[PDB]
Design an enzyme around this catalytic site. Structure first.
Site, PDB file in Angstrom:
ATOM      1  CG  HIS A  33      -1.795   1.159   1.311  1.00 22.89           C
ATOM      2  ND1 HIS A  33      -1.372   2.421   1.662  1.00 22.89           N
ATOM      3  CD2 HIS A  33      -3.108   1.264   1.003  1.00 22.89           C
ATOM      4  CE1 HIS A  33      -2.387   3.257   1.547  1.00 22.89           C
ATOM      5  NE2 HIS A  33      -3.455   2.577   1.165  1.00 22.89           N
ATOM      6  CG  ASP A  40      -0.759   6.381   2.704  1.00 24.72           C
ATOM      7  OD1 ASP A  40      -0.219   7.338   2.113  1.00 24.72           O
ATOM      8  OD2 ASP A  40      -1.990   6.326   2.950  1.00 24.72           O
ATOM      9  CE  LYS A  41       1.324   0.869   8.013  1.00 26.05           C
ATOM     10  NZ  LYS A  41       2.561   1.489   8.515  1.00 26.05           N
ATOM     11  CD  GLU A  47      12.963  18.345   8.994  1.00 20.95           C
ATOM     12  OE1 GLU A  47      12.426  17.582   9.820  1.00 20.95           O
ATOM     13  OE2 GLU A  47      12.325  18.847   8.055  1.00 20.95           O
ATOM     14  CE  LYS A  72      -7.306   0.996   2.111  1.00 25.91           C
ATOM     15  NZ  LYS A  72      -7.875   2.336   1.797  1.00 25.91           N
ATOM     16  CG  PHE A 101      -6.929  -3.069  -6.831  1.00 21.57           C
ATOM     17  CD1 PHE A 101      -5.953  -2.168  -7.146  1.00 21.57           C
ATOM     18  CD2 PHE A 101      -7.089  -3.415  -5.506  1.00 21.57           C
ATOM     19  CE1 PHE A 101      -5.147  -1.612  -6.126  1.00 21.57           C
ATOM     20  CE2 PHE A 101      -6.338  -2.868  -4.512  1.00 21.57           C
ATOM     21  CZ  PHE A 101      -5.361  -1.982  -4.826  1.00 21.57           C
ATOM     22  CE  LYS A 109      13.000  13.834  15.494  1.00 19.30           C
ATOM     23  NZ  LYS A 109      14.468  13.980  15.587  1.00 19.30           N
TER      24      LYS A 109
HETATM   25  C1  MTA Z   1      -9.092   3.926  -3.684  1.00 17.53           C
HETATM   26  S1  MTA Z   1      -7.406   4.576  -3.628  1.00 17.53           S
HETATM   27  C2  MTA Z   1      -6.883   4.263  -1.950  1.00 17.53           C
HETATM   28  C3  MTA Z   1      -6.322   2.833  -1.849  1.00 17.53           C
HETATM   29  O1  MTA Z   1      -7.235   1.943  -2.255  1.00 17.53           O
HETATM   30  C4  MTA Z   1      -6.422   0.873  -3.065  1.00 17.53           C
HETATM   31  N1  MTA Z   1      -6.903   0.894  -4.392  1.00 17.53           N
HETATM   32  C5  MTA Z   1      -6.329   1.511  -5.444  1.00 17.53           C
HETATM   33  N2  MTA Z   1      -7.005   1.234  -6.560  1.00 17.53           N
HETATM   34  C6  MTA Z   1      -8.007   0.420  -6.193  1.00 17.53           C
HETATM   35  C7  MTA Z   1      -8.949  -0.200  -6.940  1.00 17.53           C
HETATM   36  N3  MTA Z   1      -9.164  -0.110  -8.324  1.00 17.53           N
HETATM   37  N4  MTA Z   1      -9.834  -0.985  -6.322  1.00 17.53           N
HETATM   38  C8  MTA Z   1      -9.765  -1.179  -4.970  1.00 17.53           C
HETATM   39  N5  MTA Z   1      -8.848  -0.568  -4.200  1.00 17.53           N
HETATM   40  C9  MTA Z   1      -7.950   0.209  -4.860  1.00 17.53           C
HETATM   41  C10 MTA Z   1      -5.101   1.142  -2.901  1.00 17.53           C
HETATM   42  O2  MTA Z   1      -4.585   0.475  -1.677  1.00 17.53           O
HETATM   43  C11 MTA Z   1      -4.977   2.651  -2.678  1.00 17.53           C
HETATM   44  O3  MTA Z   1      -3.865   3.059  -2.001  1.00 17.53           O
HETATM   45  K     K Z   2       7.647  16.451   9.852  1.00 17.74           K
HETATM   46 MG    MG Z   3      -3.479   7.321   1.886  1.00 18.57          MG
HETATM   47 MG    MG Z   4      -7.759   5.462   4.377  1.00 18.00          MG
END
Ligand code: MTA
Ligand code: K
Ligand code: MG
Ligand code: MG
Ligand code: MTA
Ligand code: K
Ligand code: MG
Ligand code: MG
Ligand code: NA
Ligand code: NA
Ligand code: NA
Ligand code: NA
Ligand code: NA
Ligand code: NA
Ligand code: NA
Ligand code: NA
Ligand code: NA
Ligand code: NA
Ligand code: NA
Ligand code: NA
Lengths: 380, 380
Positions: free
Chosen positions: A14, A16-17, A55, A166, A235, A274
C-alpha cells in the site's frame, strides 16, 4: 447488548505503508552507524517516484539510493508490469540537517536521561484482554489477512497477486463490565491489486478459500457473514501509480484500529527523541503491563509532553470500569513504576536499536515480543 | 474523581497545516469550475518547496502556481526573512488523472445517489455537551490560542510573531454520569516562531498577557496553572524550513483533540466521494444532532464503508452512559433519520460547494455553522 466495530489494515505495498517502511529503513540505516542519529524522515511515493524530505543530523554515511531501492525490492515492486520497479524508479532526496533551534532546545548539552521531549504532543496507549496479545480482534484479523496475502504472493500459490492490498473486518461484540467479548465476524472486505489476466470469480473464490478461511477461525464465520471481495471489480493499477503515498498516513492501522484513542503523531522515520514514537510505545507498554498484571481488563493511557521538557506534562488512565481499583489508584501505580522521560524510555525499550523497519507494517503493537510488548512486573 | 486530558492545536503556518490548506485551495479551485471534480491532492512542503502529488480528474482549468502561491500568501509567508516566500518558492506538480480502475468501481455510470464509497475505511463522529459548540474544551481553547496569535500577528501588535505555532492545553475534568465537566486549566504550552530580535522574556510576558489572558477565562486559571511558553527557548527557524509538512498529518487537531476516536482518514484535498471526509462530516452531524436533540450528553458514532458500495457496512453508537435510551435504541433512531450513502450526504451537507479551504485550519468541527454543525431535528 451487542454492537459492531470495524477496523482496517493495509498491506506492505500500500503506498502509504511503502513510505512508512522506507522512512524506517532510512532510520535504521542511520542507527546502524550512529545510535544517536537525529532523524525525521518523511517519504512521498507517486508513480515512478520516491521522495525523501525532512531533517537528519547524523554521523552515518548512508546511500539513500540503495536503502530506498532495497526496501522497495523487499516489498515486491520489481517490474514495470506491477506498476513500480525498485530498479528504475526515481529517488529524490530533500534532506537537511535538524534545525539548530530545535537541537539547542531539546538535546544539546543535556544529560541523556534529562533530554527534553523532541516536540510537544499527546499520545495514547491501549490494551484489551480480548486476545492474548492484548489487542482488538478486529485489527488483529485485518492485519493477518494482509499478511496472508503477502505470504501467498511470495510463495507463488496466487501468482496474480500484487503487493498493494487493504482489508477491513467488522466484528460483533458483547459488552462485559466494560470489557468486550467478540462474538462473530459480521463483514470482511478485501481489495488487492492483481494482474491483468485473472478473472474476478477466480480471485473472489481464492480470497474466501485460501485467505479468509486460512486466517479467520470458522467459529466466527456463519451464513450471515458479509463478504466484499474485490468490491471495486478491477484493481490492476495499484501501488503509488494508483494513489500517492505519504509517511504517517496510516496511524490508526499502526496502532489500535479505531479502538482506544490517538494523539495524532506518526511513528515512522523518527528517532527516540520524538516522543510521538517513544512515548506511544511506552504508553502501550504501560497499558499492557496493567492488563497482564491483572489490574484491568481494558485500559487507555494518555501522556503528553512539551518540547524541551523531559517529564510528561500529564498522565491519565481510563479503565472502562474494568478494575476494582479506581483510575486514581492505577495512576499512582503507574507513576510509581514507570519513568516516562524520553531519556529513560530509550533505555527501558532499547530504542537506539535499528529494528524499526520491522515495525512499519502489520502494526507496531501486538507482535514479536518487542520490548514494549513485554509487560513490566508492577510493585504496589 | 478528577482526571486530566490534553489536546493540541497548530497554527495556519505550521508546515502540515500549510499543506492541508493548499490541498483544500486546490480542491476549491477545481470545484469552482467543475462541481463533480474528482480530487485527491496531497501536498508536501519543505524548505523552498511545495509539491503537489496525487490524482485529479476534472474539467476545470486550474493554475496551480497561482492557487498555491495565493494560499501561502494568505498564511503570511511572504519574505525570505520569515523562512518562506510565496513569491519565490518552488511549486512542483506531480498530478495524474484518477485511476480508471477506481473510477469504474466507484462512480462511472452510477446514479449519483447510488455512487459507491470512494474507498474502504472507518470514520467516527463525536459530540459533547461540555461546550455550546459541542466540542471538547481542551481542543477549543488550543485552537483559539492559535487564532489569537494569528490575529495579533496580522494586526501588527506583536510584529515579531511568524505564522508557525503550536499550542497545547491540559484541562482537569470531573466525571458526571458519563459526561465530563471542565474544572480548570492545568497546563498550557505555546510555541511560536519569532523574529531574531525579540527576547525570550518579552515573548513570554506577551504570550501570557496578550494571548492566554485574552482567550482563556480567568475562572479556569489559578496560581497552580503551569505555563510552558516558548519552552524550547528559541524558534527563529520555522515553517517548512524547520520541519517538513505533509497533507493529512494533523488529523487529530482537525477533529476532536484525542477525545472520541479516529478512523485514520485525512480530510484535506479530497472531494465528497472520499468518505474519509464526507462520512466523517456526516458522523459529526449525527453525533451533534443526538446531543442537541437531548438524547445524549456525549456520544461517539462509528461508520464504515467498502470501496464501490454505497451504504455503510456498519454503524455503531456509544453514549458513555449519558442517555436513558440504550445504544441500540439510539442506533435505530439514527438509521431512521439519516441516510449515510455518500451520494445522499453530498446533497444534505452541500459538499460540492468550494468552502473547503475554510475548514483546513482551526478544526473542521465546532465552528461557523457549516452544514454538519446544524443539527437535524430527529423523529422518534
Ligand atoms: C481507492 S485509492 C486508496 C487505496 O485503495 C487501493 N486501491 C487503489 N485502486 C483500487 C482499486 N481499483 N480498487 C480497490 N482498491 C484500490 C489502494 O490500496 C490505494 O492506495
Ligand atoms: K515532519
Ligand atoms: Mg493514503
Ligand atoms: Mg484510508
Ligand atoms: C519540533 S519540529 C515540529 C514542529 O514544532 C515547531 N517547531 C519548529 N521548530 C521549533 C522550535 N525551535 N521550537 C519550538 N517548536 C518548534 C514547528 O511547528 C514544527 O513544525
Ligand atoms: K493518497
Ligand atoms: Mg505532532
Ligand atoms: Mg508533522
Ligand atoms: Na521478501
Ligand atoms: Na490477555
Ligand atoms: Na464464538
Ligand atoms: Na498485468
Ligand atoms: Na485507534
Ligand atoms: Na511473540
Ligand atoms: Na490574511
Ligand atoms: Na451543548
Ligand atoms: Na470553574
Ligand atoms: Na528575523
Ligand atoms: Na481525537
Ligand atoms: Na456559528
Amino acid at each position: 447488548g451487542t454492537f459492531l466495530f470495524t477496523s482496517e489494515s493495509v498491506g506492505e505495498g500500500h503506498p502509504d505503508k511503502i513510505c512508512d517502511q522506507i522512512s524506517d529503513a532510512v532510520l535504521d540505516a542511520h542507527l546502524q552507524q550512529d545510535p544517536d542519529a537525529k532523524v525525521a524522515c518523511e517519504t512521498v511515493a507517486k508513480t515512478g517516484m520516491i521522495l525523501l524530505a525532512g531533517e537528519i543530523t547524523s554521523r552515518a554515511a548512508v546511500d539513500y539510493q540503495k536503502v530506498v531501492r532495497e526496501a522497495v525490492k523487499h516489498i515486491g515492486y520489481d517490474d514495470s508490469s506491477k506498476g513500480f520497479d525498485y530498479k528504475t524508479c526515481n529517488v529524490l532526496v530533500a534532506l537537511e540537517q535538524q534545525s539548530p533551534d530545535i537541537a539547542q532546545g531539546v538535546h544539546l548539552d543535556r544529560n541523556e536521561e534529562d533530554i527534553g521531549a523532541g516536540d510537544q504532543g499527546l499520545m495514547f496507549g491501549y490494551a484489551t484482554d480480548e486476545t492474548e496479545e492484548c489487542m482488538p480482534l478486529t485489527i488483529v484479523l485485518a492485519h493477518k489477512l494482509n499478511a496472508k496475502l503477502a505470504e501467498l504472493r511470495r510463495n507463488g500459490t496466487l501468482p496474480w497477486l500484487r503487493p498493494d492490498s487493504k482489508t477491513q473486518v467488522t466484528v460483533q461484540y458483547m459488552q462485559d463490565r466494560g470489557a468486550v467479548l467478540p462474538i462473530r465476524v459480521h463483514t470482511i472486505v478485501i481489495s488487492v491489486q492483481h494482474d491483468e489476466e485473472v478473472c474476478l470469480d477466480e480471485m473472489r473464490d481464492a480470497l474466501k478459500e485460501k485467505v479468509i478461511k486460512a486466517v479467520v477461525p470458522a467459529k466466527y464465520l456463519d451464513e450471515d457473514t458479509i463478504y466484499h471481495l474485490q468490491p471495486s471489480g478491477r484493481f490492476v493499477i495499484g501501488g503509488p501509480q494508483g494513489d500517492a503515498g505519504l509517511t504517517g498516513r496510516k496511524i490508526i492501522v499502526d496502532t489500535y484500529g479505531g479502538w482506544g484513542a490517538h494523539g495524532g503523531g506518526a511513528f515512522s522515520g523518527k528517532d527516540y527523541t520524538k516522543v510521538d514514537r517513544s512515548a506511544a510505545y511506552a504508553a502501550r507498554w504501560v497499558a499492557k503491563s496493567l492488563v497482564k498484571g491483572g489490574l484491568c481488563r481494558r485500559v487507555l493511557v494518555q501522556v503528553s509532553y512539551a518540547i524541551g521538557v523531559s517529564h510528561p506534562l500529564s498522565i491519565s488512565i481510563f479503565h472502562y470500569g474494568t478494575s476494582q481499583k479506581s483510575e486514581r489508584e492505577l495512576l499512582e501505580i503507574v507513576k510509581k513504576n514507570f519513568d516516562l522521560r524520553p531519556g529513560v524510555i530509550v533505555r527501558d525499550l532499547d530504542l537506539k536499536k535499528p529494528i524499526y523497519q520491522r515495525t512499519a507494517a502489520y502494526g507496531h503493537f501486538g507482535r514479536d515480543s518487542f520490548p514494549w510488548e513485554v509487560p513490566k512486573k508492577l510493585k504496589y
